[PDB]
From a paper:
Kinesin motor proteins hydrolyze ATP to produce force and do work in cells. Despite their diverse functions, the kinesin proteins contain a common motor domain with highly conserved or invariant sequence motifs that mediate basic motor properties, such as microtubule binding and ATP hydrolysis. For example, kinesin-14 motors move on microtubules towards the minus end instead of the plus end. Here we report a new crystal structure of human kinesin-14 KIFC1, together with new crystal structures of Drosophila Ncd, a KIFC1 orthologue, and human KIFC3, a divergent KIFC1 paralogue, and an analysis of the structural features of the proposed KIFC1 AZ82 inhibitor-binding site.
The new Ncd dimer structure (2.8 Å) was crystallized in the presence of Mg-AMP·PNP, but was refined with Mg-ADP bound to the nucleotide cleft. The new structure resembles previous mutant Ncd structures that are interpreted to show the motor as it binds to a microtubule in a force-producing conformation. However, this is the first detailed report of wild-type Ncd in a stalk-rotated conformation. Strikingly, Ncd H2 strand β3 has moved upward from its buried position in H1 – it does this by gaining a residue at its C terminus (G434), as well as its N terminus (N427). The transition of G434 to a β-strand in Ncd head H2 β3 shortens the adjacent P-loop by a glycine residue, which may make the P-loop less flexible and more likely to release bound nucleotide. This is consistent with the reduced density of ADP bound to head H2 compared to head H1, supporting the interpretation that head H2 is releasing ADP, representing a microtubule-binding conformation.
Author numbering:
A (entry chain A): 292 to 384, 392 to 539, 548 to 587, 599 to 671
B (entry chain B): 292 to 385, 391 to 470, 472 to 493, 518 to 540, 550 to 565, 572 to 587, 600 to 616, 621 to 633, ...
Write the structure that this text describes.
Amino acid sequence: MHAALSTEVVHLRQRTEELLRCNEQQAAELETCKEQLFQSNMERKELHNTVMDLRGNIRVFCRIRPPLESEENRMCCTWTYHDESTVELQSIDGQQIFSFDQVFHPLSSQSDIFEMVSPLIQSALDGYNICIFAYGQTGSGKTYTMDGVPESVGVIPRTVDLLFDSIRGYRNLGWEYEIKATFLEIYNEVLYDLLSNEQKDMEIRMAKNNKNDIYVSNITEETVLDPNHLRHLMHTAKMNRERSSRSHAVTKLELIGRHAEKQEISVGSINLVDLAGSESPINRSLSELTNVILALLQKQDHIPYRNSKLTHLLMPSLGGNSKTLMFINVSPFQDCFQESVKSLRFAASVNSCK
Amino acid sequence: MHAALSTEVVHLRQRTEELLRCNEQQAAELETCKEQLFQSNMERKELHNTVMDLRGNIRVFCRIRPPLESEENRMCCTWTYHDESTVELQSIDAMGQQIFSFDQVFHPLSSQSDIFEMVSPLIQSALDGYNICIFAYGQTGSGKTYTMDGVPESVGVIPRTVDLLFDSIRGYRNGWEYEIKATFLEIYNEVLYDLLTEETVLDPNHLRHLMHTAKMNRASSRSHAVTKLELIGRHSVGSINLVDLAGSESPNRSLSELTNVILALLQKPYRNSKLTHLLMPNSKTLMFINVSPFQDCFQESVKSLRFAASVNS
Ligand SMILES: Nc1ncnc2c1ncn2[C@@H]1O[C@H](COP(=O)(O)OP(=O)(O)O)[C@@H](O)[C@H]1O
Ligand SMILES: Nc1ncnc2c1ncn2[C@@H]1O[C@H](COP(=O)(O)OP(=O)(O)O)[C@@H](O)[C@H]1O
Ligand SMILES: [Mg+2]
Ligand SMILES: [Mg+2]
């Protein structure tokens, strides 16, 4: 029937028009709602950075680890908690008393450490560069603090979990993030790619599009596909890892946020560093690191970032906007007393610079 | 013909279903977008509270009122906003402070709800144990009373606190109970009048009554309406103080002395005033700066803003 179809047409043209009109309203609500979300996040980002700056752009923390079941009779020096931020030790045989942004004691969980770190993962997604360092003599807690242990995982694994949850969320704002992972060791001034097997030679060079950012030649830079992929690379890296005690390990995650609708990008790094041991027998990098950090604090003209591989590697995450956490790991025992004191005296130098 | 318009109906069945799916994805996107916007704005407000906590015990907000029903003919000065917290006004006829930074600047279209939203945080602090002073400053005509008390149709801050403040306490009685010594008083010329003599409260509606009492029982408007709300709790001593002040315009010694007194505190001198003693606040205080958008209130606004600025020092 022709009248049937003539009717269906006339009816579809009515419908088609009410939809076309409705879709134009939705679109126009979307456009402004899209605009107010972008701006609101811009504002949330700035309020966040301000809270980080008020707490301090570089912050030092202490963590005395528990004793080991193994040696239930290494004598521990006398530890005394003057407050939540101040700590003192005495040898068994002046006063050794040190202030920090926070002191973590032997029953502080991994979770508790991460609480100091998780806010900075956001700073990295907002486009800032972050350094988390673990410092102190061998035995003192560094590896346990950064990598940790399957039963109680450390900073790095927690960072990854938060990174994927956070990235999932960001899609709802139009941001498509991409992580670039790299793992490397540093020994006697030479870099080693822990994702490679071939022995190759890698130098640190100025970037393509920013003379202040850094570029490492001939390193494996993996674009993470999902957590499973990262999990694999993590595992792999641990595999290729008294040399280990004198090697610095740097895990780096470069967050690369593209917002196509607005054509803005947001790139921030995370630099997770299991430093080498602070014990007197590193000769170059570890000493230069400590100078570089202290110089930052004193607001000095020029800074010898290029006097060492490590300070060169981390240069774009040490000046200016970057934020920096430093976890001083310490062993409670008496035979570590003098070395523990050396460790803690960097805390003294740090806040000696105000 | 049968061929022709059978082609047509198919083509339209496509555009129809095609547009319906696109209407569908839009619908969803919008629902998502609004959720996220809500969520982003909440985090923003929580950070904004943190920032004000960590940097001092004294917040300053500025509210510009919209022109009144009966004032379409009135000439407005030019208002320029740079930030959520930065505002500038220029005279209409084309040296010194002309652009001011506060903790928040509220537009003429700011609801009584949005204003209170920013004070909410300080209320719960009082339960926690602190003394809160909420001042309203400005020239007569500006917004002090409207903002503080409000009007039966769109309630102000003083009432709104009550709502939240009970929402709070039912949460606390869940091994903690709270007594609420209330207080209401005015100040004309150094004279300590009443408005009811403190009266302990035991009900949500009980307030709204004596709240309604003092209101009508109150009054020209060149007098301070203080309103203590002392709170104690036993298993948390504290207070809330809410103040609508006398006009800030040209002659009120108490105000010029209120000013003097605050230069001292921020600078870490009383009570030369009467209000100043009464309010002896370890105490988070907030201040509203009400301002009129009109060109004949220009210099007076600049008086208020420049005063608000010095406060931020
Ligand atoms: N917070 C802690 N809780 C329990 N065990 C810890 C803690 N910190 C370190 N350890 C243990 O102490 C030892 C110290 O080595 P580790 O800190 O992992 O590397 P490094 O000694 O090079 O800093 C490890 O065997 C680890 O099991
Ligand atoms: N945000 C606002 N929205 C609408 N009207 C307002 C607003 N603020 C003040 N007004 C009106 O402007 C007038 C100014 O008086 P008001 O500010 O309430 O008392 P005071 O001048 O003592 O501060 C009132 O009539 C009030 O209703
Ligand atoms: Mg180690
Ligand atoms: Mg009034």
